[PDB]
Amino acid sequence: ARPTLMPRAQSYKDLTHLPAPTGKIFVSVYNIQDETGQFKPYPASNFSTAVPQSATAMLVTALKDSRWFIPLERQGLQNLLNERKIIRAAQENGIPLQSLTAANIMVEGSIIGYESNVKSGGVGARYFGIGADTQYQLDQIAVNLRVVNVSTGEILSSVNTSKTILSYEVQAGVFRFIDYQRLLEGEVGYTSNEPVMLCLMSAIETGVIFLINDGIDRGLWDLQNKAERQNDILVKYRHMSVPPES
Amino acid sequence: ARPTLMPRAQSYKDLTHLPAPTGKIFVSVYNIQDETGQFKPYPASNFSTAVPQSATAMLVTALKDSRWFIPLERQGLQNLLNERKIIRAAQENGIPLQSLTAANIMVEGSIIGYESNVKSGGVGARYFGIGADTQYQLDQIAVNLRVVNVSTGEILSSVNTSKTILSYEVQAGVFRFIDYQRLLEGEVGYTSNEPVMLCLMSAIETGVIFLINDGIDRGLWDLQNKAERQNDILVKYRHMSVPPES
Amino acid sequence: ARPTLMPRAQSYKDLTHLPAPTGKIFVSVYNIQDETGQFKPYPASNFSTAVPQSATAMLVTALKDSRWFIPLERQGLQNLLNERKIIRAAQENGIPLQSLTAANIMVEGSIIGYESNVKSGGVGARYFGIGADTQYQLDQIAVNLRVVNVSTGEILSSVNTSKTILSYEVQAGVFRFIDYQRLLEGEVGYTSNEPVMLCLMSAIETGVIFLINDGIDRGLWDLQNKAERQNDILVKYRHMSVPPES
Amino acid sequence: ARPTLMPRAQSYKDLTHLPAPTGKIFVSVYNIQDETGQFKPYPASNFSTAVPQSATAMLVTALKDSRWFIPLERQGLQNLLNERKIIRAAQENGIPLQSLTAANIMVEGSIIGYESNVKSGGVGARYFGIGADTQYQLDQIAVNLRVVNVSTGEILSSVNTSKTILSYEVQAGVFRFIDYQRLLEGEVGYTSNEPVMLCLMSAIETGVIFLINDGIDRGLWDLQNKAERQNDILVKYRHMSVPPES
Amino acid sequence: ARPTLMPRAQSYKDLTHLPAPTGKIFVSVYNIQDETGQFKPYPASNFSTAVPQSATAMLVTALKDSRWFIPLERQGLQNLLNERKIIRAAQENGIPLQSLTAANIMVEGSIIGYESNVKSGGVGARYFGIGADTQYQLDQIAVNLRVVNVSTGEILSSVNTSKTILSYEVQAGVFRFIDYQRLLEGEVGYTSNEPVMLCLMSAIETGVIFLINDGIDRGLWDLQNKAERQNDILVKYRHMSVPPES
Amino acid sequence: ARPTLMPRAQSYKDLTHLPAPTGKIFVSVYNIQDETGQFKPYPASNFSTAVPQSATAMLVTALKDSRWFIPLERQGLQNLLNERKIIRAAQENGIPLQSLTAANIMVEGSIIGYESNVKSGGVGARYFGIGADTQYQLDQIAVNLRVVNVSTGEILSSVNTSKTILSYEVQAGVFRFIDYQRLLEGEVGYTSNEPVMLCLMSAIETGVIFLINDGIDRGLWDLQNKAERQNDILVKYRHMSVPPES
Amino acid sequence: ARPTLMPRAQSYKDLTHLPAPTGKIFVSVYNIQDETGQFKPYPASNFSTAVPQSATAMLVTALKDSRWFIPLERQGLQNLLNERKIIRAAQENGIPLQSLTAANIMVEGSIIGYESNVKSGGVGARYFGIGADTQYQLDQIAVNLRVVNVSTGEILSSVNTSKTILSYEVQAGVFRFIDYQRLLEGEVGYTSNEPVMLCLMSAIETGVIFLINDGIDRGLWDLQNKAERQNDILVKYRHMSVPPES
Amino acid sequence: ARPTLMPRAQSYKDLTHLPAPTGKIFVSVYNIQDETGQFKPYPASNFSTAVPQSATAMLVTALKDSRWFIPLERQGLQNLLNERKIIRAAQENGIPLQSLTAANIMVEGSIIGYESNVKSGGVGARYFGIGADTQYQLDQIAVNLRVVNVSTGEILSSVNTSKTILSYEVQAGVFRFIDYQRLLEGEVGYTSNEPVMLCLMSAIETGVIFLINDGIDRGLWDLQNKAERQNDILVKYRHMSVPPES
Amino acid sequence: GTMTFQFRNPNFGGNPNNGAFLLNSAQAQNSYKDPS
Amino acid sequence: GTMTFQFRNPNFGGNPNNGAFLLNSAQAQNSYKDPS
């Protein structure tokens, strides 16, 4: 096909239309570790991880496009410090650069577990020759995000989100004897694996709005206008603040 | 589906409605090690661990939402100390930050073993063509949590909790000869693996309430009101203080 | 089901009702190494250990609930020393902490071997269509515990305990021809693996009482009252002081 | 066949005809990490990565041929610094070289996940002997690119792109009995795997134009002529600035 | 069943009733290395060692219960020295401990080889339907122990012991046709693997008595009474002092 | 069975009855490396070595019981030096030990190769139902030992020995039809693998006598009496001084 | 059987009867590396090397028994230097040793490749029931040896030798029907793998005589008598000085 | 068979009869790396390299026997420098050695790739019972050698050579029914793998003559007599100086 | 452990080795004769 | 997990072990006699 932007869920359109704050908040995003410890089963490789190791690149895109935070490069800090030695070596030899911008808070977190085959199922039916069947699985991924006050070392707010990755498959088939000593045959199949790459981005973009909403109730950072406290987006994520039961 | 919060058991609603203490207690949560040493069997990978390595991110969410403890960032301490060098380098060049908040106690612990296939079973039945069957397994996970007084190095209280992870499967089936030289066929199946990701969170959130309850009987920390000593939650976890037999 | 405490054998109720000593004895529990060197066979993973690596977390729970010892944090000593640097850095900047409590003895030990399939067996029987069978295995685990006088470096007492882990399986079955050209079928099965997680805790909790009993006969530490020397618990573990034969 | 240049998509002809800026912008491209963590399944090797590790060599070719950036060697910096020790050793012994050119911005990024078998399918049909079938899979790759201001450490713009890698297969076949006791047979097959090597280059060359376009709207760097703001290329990538839905 | 002491062979009752010496001899037991280099075959894991790595914990129990030696902690010396830094840090801040007790001799050694399937065998018999069979294997383990004079570095005495680990299996079976068109079936089986964990302890406890007996003939250490030189135990291990032939 | 000494070949009785020298010769035995590089084939583990790694513990037993050499602890020298720091620390605090005894020569060597299946064979025979067969293999192990003068660094004498490890198997069998519609069946089998653990000890104990005999002809060390030069043992190993042909 | 010396080829009897030189030449033999890089195929282990790693112990035996060279311990030099620290520590405390003997030349080399299945073959024949067959393989090993003048660093002489390792197998068999409804059966087999352990020793012992012969023609070292230049051994290895063709 | 020299191709007889130069040229041969990265397929081991790692020992034999170069020991330089410390330690204690000879040029290079199964093929034919077949493969190996001027660091000449390794197999067979109810059978087979050990030596010995010939045309080193410029050997390698086409 | 769903029928996605058992256990139980 | 599409027919790309079941379950259901 053609290259385009990464496709986005309802939460990304729900994230962009957030109310604006008074001033933007700097944030250091160091590392979101893949602490699932779960690899892909057969017939994949023994080494391929179930969740991609790039959750820290997805969170920076969530914070930057939210129009609330100004993210700072702390992932490739060792490459950024090696670049600022090269500018400083050319300064003394034939504008002076200022120091690095430092953040008030640092958002860090994990990917707390990935369970595959939480539920399964399947229907099938064959009359005389003609058949059809269905299958589905759904895996569950969970993301932990917490805001750390870097001044004192405390933890301000911590939320857990979740997402269900549905992977179904529909297949038909015909194996009959049409009129004597002739044999008909046909198959039509279709599968659809939802990518865990794209369901991780929709669970992180939702967990950001639970951090921004929890900052307003706890008085951490205030909105630009108090009349926009009753926005339809923030009243939608306040009903989801209680978790589902089990 | 849609992203939401991580689903919570009865213990989380049992944890939030705890009585309030006099003052909040700081706590350092360094590392909860996966000391099970148990990996997933075939047909999963040889490398995938049976229990996720993110138990330390689950305990901080249990302590923070309990409204008793103020957790402190000690997991990513090496990233937090590297951030406070960048602020301090911009302080001398063109508000002074205070030191890190230190804790009175430090909650640490482990995951003491994970045994798979503790019990099993299964029924089956086939009359003329029509069939049905059932299966179930249940695994057992155990969590150790202990409170360490960091002033003297003693151990104040230590509790062990447990949880049973049921994983059943129901399947039907029909393979008959309906009226001469025609063949009917149908299958309906359904499995349900309970996630070990979610049963680890319910065993940790229960083991926190056995630490808070054991602090009140031993005089470690006292409640805000002594009339709330007879709460229905704390009288429920005092009956469970004796272990089951074997 | 519901989360609860870890289920306990007869030895835990036998451990709690011990007589009280004159004063509690501090103890350092550094590391109990899994020196079995035995991994799980097929169809488990090649990497999963047969005995969990968390025996040092189980012994601290045995010593703490015995109401004789005050255990000290020496497992996570490197995390406890890093915490006391953070308090000491905030002391000089804008109560002085005392030093770590040190122990008189240090209980250390191992897990001396785990042999699987020590005994086996099985019965089976089929008459006309109807059948039944049984199987059982029993594995053997052994725990070494020894008390080290830390003043001189000697070894005061050393005991070995053992436990047999029974794992049976009962299965029925019917494959008959009921009245002409109909076919009956039924299966009922049930297995029960005793967890090695829970049989390790019952062998450690028994080996503690053989250390406390051996301290009284050797004059290491004395009871609070000499009339309680003739307790029914201590007279029960004196008959078991001679080992079984082979 | 014959060696030639690497074949290029529509985006490369779309990249070369961009409007010219006022002055060229230096850029350091250190490392684009393969953070997919996904390896190739059977019957390939267990060790072969799904995405090539050479994305940092592809981005430099995209920046250099865009006629906007002057890329700088920062990948083999340790080899370039060892060369400048050899020139400097021959300078003191029997033109003095200037220092390294340093960049204003540094483009860095990742490959955020690679999901294989996102969709599948297949048709088949056999009448009397003569048959035909079809298959197709399509994998999805995603590339993260972000521009880091190296003076302050902020992140200026960050975009995500995506690409679908179609891999189909068409096969015919005949197995008949032509006139008595003779047997005809024929097969014709054809597959076509689109290379992930070449679809990674088309997703990076598209993500560069989303960085150049986002610089003009945010006032980072301005065009040479404001009448060329309404170019047909830049108005084409402004309609694609909103992502697809899911 | 119930936890108990580790079951002991004839040699342990033969070890406890040894004559008493003049004074007890200190001994350092550093490490008994598993130098077999033999792992368990299929269907066990590739990684599980044939002999447990805990022979050094078994020898200390043999020396301590022999009522001749006072063993010293030299295995966990790095943990014992870290404990004595904590006492010494609390000494200068608000009884002085003496130095470590040092030994006259140090008993060290190895496990010299483990050969599996030294001998095998098996009988079988089936008449009309009714059957029975038998199998047996026997493995051979060997233990080296030597006493090192730590003053001069010489080797005082060195002995090799051996043990045969029998593992048999008995199985019956019936597959007949009882009265027309009925089918009887029955199986009864029983195996018994002798543990290599327990046969290593009986080869070490025997090799200790060959060290104590060889000390009396060489004048290394003398008995408390010379009339007890003619004990029935020491005259039993003097007849076994010559090895079997091959 | 019962524990006993390791069974010994003809060479051990041939080694003990050697003539006595003038004075005993000290010897350092550092390490005999398993330089075979040969592991065990299927169905054993991939990791289990064919020859045990404990040849250095077998040579010390050969030198000590030969009544010619006084061996010195140089294998666990790092443990012996750590013990003599503990005595020396208790000397200055509230008999002075002499230095380590040093050797005139140092016996070192290797295990030069282990070839499996050098020869094989097998007979079989079946008449009407009744059968019998035989198999045998023989492996070959070789041991290098050389005496190094530690004063100058020269090599005084070097010998190579060899041993053949026979492993046979005898099996019978009956599968007949005794009187009409009855079926007899019987099997009797027996294998015998000679241990490579025990054939390594008999090749080392022989290679010691070729070192002691070569010392007398070269004038390295002389006998106590020259009339015992014509002993029946030393005249037996002088005929074997020429190697077999090939 | 019985232990004996390692069996020797024609070259060893050809090596011992060499003419005597004027004076013996010291030689350092550091390491002969197994640079084949070839491991054993199935059904052996994946890790077992095709050629043993002990070629450096075989060359020292070739040089020592040649009555021309005096070899020096340079393999275990780190053990020999640790021994001479122990003598020197006892010298200053309550004969002074001279320095190590150093060599004029140092013989070093490699094992240049090992190719398995260079040639193969096999005959078979079956008439009515009675059969017979034959197989053979032959592998090829090559040894490089070169003499290095240690004074200047030059290479004096370098030779390559080779050897063919034949491994045959002969098997018979009978499967007939002797007189009606009786069945005869018999098999007789025999294999013989020549050891690569023993063919490496015969290729090294031959390559030594090509070094000694090349020293006399180049004037490196001269014989004791010039009349012995025309020996039958040295005139035999001068005809083999030209290589075979290919 | 019997040990002999390594068999040599036409190029070795073509190398020895080269014209003589004015003076011999010293050369350092450090390391020829196996940069093929190709291992042997099934049924060999996974670890065995396709090309031996001893190409640096083969090149020194090519340079030494060419009667043009004097090679220097630079492979085992760390062993040669450790030997010259031992001579120098005996010099000061109770002829002074000169420094190492250093080279004008240093020949280094690689093994640029090894492709297996470049071509294949096979014929077969069976009439009534009697059959025959043939197979062949041919692999391709390539060697890079380049002369480095060590004074300035330039590269003087660089050549690539190649060789084709043919491996064929011929097999016959008979499976007939000779006169009624008798069965004849016979097989005759023969394979021949050309060793890659020996084809690497013939590609290196050819690549040396392309270096010596390229030195004379470029004026690097001149012949002893200009009348020998027109030798039949050097005019033969000048026609091969142009490569084959593809 | 994990309970993964699989069809027991080789017509759908399932193991093909119990195809010969599924058909032989169906023709051993049918009682429909040929109508004519 | 991942749902990979595979044909259930050995004529197309599929497992060959259910070929003998696919044909035996088709000839046990056909009702077409020989026309003549």
Coordinates of C-alpha atoms in Angstrom, one line a residue, chain D:
Chain D
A1 CA 20.8 -9.7 -13.5
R2 CA 22.8 -6.5 -13.3
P3 CA 23.7 -4.3 -10.3
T4 CA 21.8 -1.1 -9.9
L5 CA 20.6 1.4 -7.4
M6 CA 18.2 0.3 -4.7
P7 CA 14.6 0.6 -6.0
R8 CA 12.6 3.5 -4.5
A9 CA 9.0 4.1 -3.8
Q10 CA 6.8 7.1 -4.6
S11 CA 8.0 8.8 -1.4
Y12 CA 11.6 9.1 -2.6
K13 CA 10.5 11.0 -5.7
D14 CA 8.2 12.9 -3.3
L15 CA 11.2 13.7 -1.1
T16 CA 13.6 15.0 -3.7
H17 CA 11.2 17.6 -5.1
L18 CA 10.8 19.3 -1.8
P19 CA 11.1 23.1 -1.7
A20 CA 14.5 24.5 -0.7
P21 CA 15.2 26.1 2.7
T22 CA 17.2 29.2 3.6
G23 CA 20.2 27.3 4.9
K24 CA 21.0 23.6 5.5
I25 CA 20.7 22.2 9.0
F26 CA 23.4 20.0 10.5
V27 CA 22.2 16.8 12.1
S28 CA 23.7 14.0 14.2
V29 CA 22.3 10.5 13.6
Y30 CA 23.7 8.4 16.4
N31 CA 21.7 5.1 16.5
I32 CA 18.2 3.9 15.6
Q33 CA 17.7 0.9 17.8
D34 CA 15.8 -2.2 16.6
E35 CA 13.5 -2.3 19.6
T36 CA 11.0 -4.7 18.0
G37 CA 12.4 -7.7 19.9
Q38 CA 10.9 -9.9 17.2
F39 CA 12.7 -12.7 15.5
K40 CA 11.8 -14.8 12.4
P41 CA 9.7 -17.9 12.9
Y42 CA 10.2 -21.5 11.6
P43 CA 11.6 -22.6 9.1
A44 CA 14.1 -19.7 9.4
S45 CA 16.8 -19.6 12.0
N46 CA 16.0 -18.9 15.7
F47 CA 18.5 -16.0 15.6
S48 CA 17.6 -14.0 12.5
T49 CA 15.9 -10.7 13.3
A50 CA 12.7 -9.8 11.6
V51 CA 13.8 -6.2 10.9
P52 CA 17.4 -5.4 9.8
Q53 CA 19.7 -3.7 12.2
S54 CA 20.7 -1.1 9.6
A55 CA 18.0 1.5 10.0
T56 CA 20.6 4.2 10.9
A57 CA 22.3 3.8 7.5
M58 CA 18.9 4.2 5.8
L59 CA 18.0 7.4 7.6
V60 CA 21.3 9.1 6.6
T61 CA 20.6 8.4 3.0
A62 CA 17.1 9.9 3.5
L63 CA 18.5 13.1 5.1
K64 CA 21.4 13.5 2.6
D65 CA 19.3 13.2 -0.6
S66 CA 16.5 15.4 0.8
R67 CA 18.7 18.5 0.0
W68 CA 17.8 20.0 3.4
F69 CA 20.2 18.4 5.9
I70 CA 23.9 18.0 6.1
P71 CA 24.4 14.7 8.0
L72 CA 27.4 14.2 10.2
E73 CA 29.4 11.0 11.0
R74 CA 28.5 10.0 14.5
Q75 CA 28.0 6.3 14.0
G76 CA 31.6 5.5 13.4
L77 CA 32.8 8.3 15.7
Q78 CA 35.3 6.0 17.5
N79 CA 36.9 5.2 14.1
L80 CA 36.9 8.8 13.1
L81 CA 38.6 9.9 16.3
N82 CA 41.3 7.3 15.9
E83 CA 42.0 8.6 12.4
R84 CA 42.4 12.2 13.7
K85 CA 45.0 11.0 16.2
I86 CA 47.1 9.7 13.3
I87 CA 46.9 13.0 11.4
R88 CA 47.8 14.9 14.7
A89 CA 50.8 12.6 15.3
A90 CA 52.1 13.4 11.8
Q91 CA 51.5 17.2 12.4
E92 CA 54.2 17.7 15.1
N93 CA 56.6 15.4 13.3
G94 CA 58.2 16.3 10.0
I95 CA 47.5 22.4 7.0
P96 CA 46.3 22.2 10.6
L97 CA 42.9 20.4 10.8
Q98 CA 39.9 22.2 12.3
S99 CA 37.6 20.6 14.9
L100 CA 34.6 18.5 14.1
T101 CA 31.5 20.2 12.8
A102 CA 28.8 20.0 15.5
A103 CA 25.0 19.9 14.9
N104 CA 22.1 22.1 15.9
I105 CA 19.6 19.2 16.1
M106 CA 20.1 15.5 16.4
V107 CA 17.5 13.2 14.7
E108 CA 17.1 9.9 16.6
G109 CA 14.4 7.3 16.9
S110 CA 13.5 3.7 16.9
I111 CA 11.6 1.0 15.1
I112 CA 8.5 0.7 17.3
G113 CA 7.4 -2.9 16.9
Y114 CA 6.9 -5.3 14.0
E115 CA 3.8 -7.5 14.0
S116 CA 3.7 -10.4 11.6
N117 CA 0.4 -11.9 10.2
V118 CA -1.8 -9.0 10.9
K119 CA -4.2 -10.2 8.3
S120 CA -4.3 -13.4 6.2
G121 CA -6.6 -15.1 3.8
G122 CA -6.9 -17.5 0.9
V123 CA -9.2 -18.8 -1.8
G124 CA -9.2 -22.2 -3.4
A125 CA -11.2 -24.1 -6.0
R126 CA -11.0 -27.5 -7.6
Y127 CA -13.3 -29.0 -10.2
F128 CA -12.6 -32.3 -11.8
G129 CA -8.8 -32.5 -11.6
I130 CA -8.1 -28.8 -12.4
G131 CA -7.4 -26.6 -9.4
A132 CA -6.2 -23.1 -8.3
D133 CA -5.6 -21.3 -5.1
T134 CA -4.3 -18.0 -3.6
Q135 CA -2.8 -16.9 -0.3
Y136 CA -1.7 -13.6 1.1
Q137 CA -0.3 -12.2 4.4
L138 CA 0.5 -8.7 5.4
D139 CA 2.8 -7.7 8.2
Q140 CA 3.0 -4.2 9.8
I141 CA 6.1 -2.2 10.6
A142 CA 6.3 1.1 12.5
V143 CA 9.0 3.7 12.7
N144 CA 9.5 6.4 15.4
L145 CA 11.5 9.5 14.5
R146 CA 12.0 12.5 16.8
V147 CA 14.1 15.7 16.5
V148 CA 16.0 16.5 19.7
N149 CA 17.2 20.1 20.2
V150 CA 20.8 19.4 21.5
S151 CA 21.2 22.9 23.0
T152 CA 18.5 22.5 25.7
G153 CA 17.7 18.8 25.5
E154 CA 14.0 19.3 24.5
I155 CA 12.1 17.3 21.9
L156 CA 10.9 19.4 19.1
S157 CA 8.7 17.1 17.0
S158 CA 8.0 13.4 17.0
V159 CA 6.1 11.4 14.4
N160 CA 5.1 7.7 13.9
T161 CA 4.8 6.1 10.4
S162 CA 3.7 2.7 9.3
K163 CA 3.8 0.4 6.3
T164 CA 2.1 -2.9 5.3
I165 CA 4.2 -5.6 3.8
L166 CA 2.1 -7.8 1.5
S167 CA 3.3 -11.3 0.7
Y168 CA 1.1 -13.3 -1.7
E169 CA 1.3 -16.7 -3.4
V170 CA -0.6 -18.1 -6.4
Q171 CA -0.6 -21.7 -7.4
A172 CA -2.4 -23.8 -10.0
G173 CA -2.4 -27.5 -10.6
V174 CA -3.8 -30.4 -12.7
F175 CA -4.1 -34.1 -11.7
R176 CA -6.4 -35.8 -14.2
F177 CA -6.9 -39.0 -16.0
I178 CA -6.8 -38.2 -19.7
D179 CA -8.0 -41.0 -22.1
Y180 CA -7.9 -44.4 -20.5
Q181 CA -4.8 -45.4 -18.4
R182 CA -2.9 -42.2 -19.1
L183 CA -2.3 -39.5 -16.5
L184 CA -1.8 -35.8 -17.0
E185 CA 0.0 -33.6 -14.5
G186 CA 1.0 -29.9 -14.3
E187 CA 1.8 -27.3 -11.7
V188 CA 2.4 -23.6 -12.0
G189 CA 3.3 -21.5 -8.9
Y190 CA 4.5 -18.0 -8.1
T191 CA 5.1 -16.3 -4.8
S192 CA 6.2 -12.7 -4.1
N193 CA 7.5 -11.6 -0.7
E194 CA 7.8 -7.8 -0.4
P195 CA 11.1 -7.2 1.3
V196 CA 11.1 -5.7 4.8
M197 CA 14.4 -4.2 3.8
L198 CA 12.7 -2.0 1.2
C199 CA 9.5 -1.2 3.2
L200 CA 11.6 0.1 6.0
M201 CA 13.3 2.5 3.6
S202 CA 9.9 3.8 2.4
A203 CA 8.6 4.3 5.9
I204 CA 11.7 6.3 7.0
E205 CA 11.7 8.4 3.8
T206 CA 8.0 9.3 4.5
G207 CA 8.7 10.1 8.2
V208 CA 11.4 12.6 7.2
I209 CA 8.8 14.7 5.2
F210 CA 6.6 14.7 8.3
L211 CA 9.5 16.2 10.2
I212 CA 10.3 18.8 7.6
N213 CA 6.6 19.8 7.3
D214 CA 6.2 20.0 11.0
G215 CA 9.2 22.3 11.3
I216 CA 7.5 24.9 9.0
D217 CA 4.2 25.1 10.9
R218 CA 6.0 25.4 14.3
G219 CA 8.4 28.1 13.1
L220 CA 11.5 25.9 13.7
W221 CA 13.1 26.5 10.3
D222 CA 11.6 28.6 7.5
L223 CA 11.5 28.2 3.7
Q224 CA 13.6 30.2 1.3
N225 CA 10.4 31.7 -0.3
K226 CA 7.0 32.0 1.4
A227 CA 5.2 31.6 -2.0
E228 CA 6.5 28.0 -2.0
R229 CA 4.6 27.3 1.3
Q230 CA 1.6 26.3 -0.9
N231 CA 3.5 23.5 -2.8
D232 CA 1.6 20.5 -3.9
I233 CA 3.9 18.2 -1.9
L234 CA 3.5 20.0 1.4
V235 CA -0.3 20.3 0.9
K236 CA -0.3 16.6 0.3
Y237 CA 1.4 15.7 3.6
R238 CA -0.9 18.1 5.5
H239 CA -4.0 16.1 4.6
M240 CA -2.2 13.0 5.9
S241 CA -1.3 14.7 9.2
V242 CA -4.4 13.3 10.9
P243 CA -4.0 9.5 11.5
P244 CA -6.3 6.7 10.3
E245 CA -8.8 5.4 12.8
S246 CA -9.1 1.9 14.3

